[PDB]
């Protein structure tokens with residue numbers, strides 16, 4: 001079984017969010033579980049520079065101009081790169097320019113991604129051809145469309161990491177992407193009178209997965225599907241929709257071995273976490289106090305993630321004696337809002353606007369609670385990281401958050417399954433109740449410790465995930 005992942009990011013080479021973490025860890029897990037998995041990425045600068053053994057496989061002309069297909073390895077996994085400098089040789093985000101504007105040629109940049117994914121199924125690489133093309137999110141959404149147009153020389157799965165990103169392009173671009181014009185149909189990649197790459201992936205794939213069992217349910221609903229629910233309901237009925245929960249990469253996210261930490265620690269030596277908290281408080285200008293709960297945010301600052309709710313609840317949190325350590329970027333209103341709170345409440349509110357990989361680890365290893373009040377959450381990796389680091393996740397019950405966190409209810413505590421705090425509704429009052437629950441648990445140190453150790457006992461294994469994907473690939 002040979003599988004090609006088609007995607008736009010991969011940790012540690014290029015990352016804007018959780019998708020990169022997944023691509024950086026799944027393929028190796030699949031190889032251990034007996035599937036020959038390879039990865040296809042655009043040759044973005046940071047990616048090309050990481051793959052130092054990359055060699056030329058072939059050269060082609062395409063509707064978007066020439067590509068050189070390269071192939072190398074990273075961390076033992078086979079990596080293909082689409083070198084097409086006129087499309088991909090630009091710094092920063094795969095998706096937008098430095099002024100945050102989508103590239104005007106995005107339609108070509110990502111259509112080509114899909115095209116090369118499909119072409120691989122027809123011998124683009126004379127030495128290796130995938131049995132399954134595994135496309136991720138809209139970026140790779142055309143892979144299954146090109147495959148369908150070519151008579152399906154390989155089977156395909158399309159994995160939804162997030163349905164809110166639809167890859168919408170004007171219909172006239174049908175002229176530019178070398179697909180049958182008959183594909184521009186509601187039974188095809190048309191969506192509200194435009195081309196949707198997401199629609200294309202959902203429609204043409206042999207099978208669709210989502211990154212958690214609950215999200216796979218949710219996206220058959222209008223409030224999570226944003227118009228796509230009819231296709232997904234039909235695919236569910238056809239048995240062509242399923243959920244497979246993400247793992248966590250233990251090479252990167254383990255307090256036991258995390259080299260980015262002032263102090264490493266384990267489920268049975270949580271006293272060794274204290275130094276991380278102390279240094280986190282110092283680094284952020286917080287009062288150095290071990291009697292007070294430190295709440296953490298590592299997140300995009302947006303409504304999708306519920307960070308407006310955090311801002312609204314902040315006074316309530318401060319009033320009860322908690323601290324906040326926040327790292328993130330997003331809505332300028334929220335950025336400014338949080339900077340204002342840090343200025344207004346120095347010593348209890350520490351804020352850092354921007355993206356900092358290493359600092360996220362120091363927050364994860366030092367905070368007591370991580371706030372993940374997502375409005376929707378296909379998976380929510382930061383919360384799985386919280387569990388592993390014994391920093392209790394405080395989450396809204398939606399998507400993967402609902403699959404993985406157990407509220408500190410009486411029965412969960414009694415059954416020894418409690419592992420964090422869960423609230424229900426997307427408002428500050430609802431959030432504030434969970435926050436109060438955390439203060440109540442904090443006032444009982446031995447119960448807190450009990451819950452920390454259960455949080456750290458939870459396991460999210462990529463090789464277990466690989467086994468589900470394998471079963472799926474063989475059913476296709």
Ligand SMILES: Nc1ncnc2c1ncn2[C@@H]1O[C@H](COP(=O)(O)OP(=O)(O)O)[C@@H](O)[C@H]1O
Pocket residue numbers: 016017018019021298299300327328329354355356357360379380381382383
């Ligand atoms: N400002 C930031 N600094 C460092 N890492 C961040 C920042 N914002 C998000 N991340 C990281 O991005 C990933 C987000 O994954 P996840 O929580 O599943 O959300 P999503 O898939 O929507 O990006 C996590 O690794 C998280 O730690």
Ligand SMILES: O=S(=O)(O)C[C@H](O)CN1CCN(CCO)CC1
Pocket residue numbers: 016017018019020095096102137161162165166167
């Ligand atoms: O907004 S864009 O469509 O231009 C950019 C992408 O959709 C960015 N992503 C990456 C993957 N995501 C979810 C999986 O981590 C968030 C959307």
Ligand SMILES: OC[C@H]1O[C@H](O)[C@H](O)[C@@H](O)[C@@H]1O
Pocket residue numbers: 164165300302303304305
């Ligand atoms: O965060 C970026 C945005 O992405 C999507 O468009 C969501 O619909 C929105 O809620 C979110 O804030």
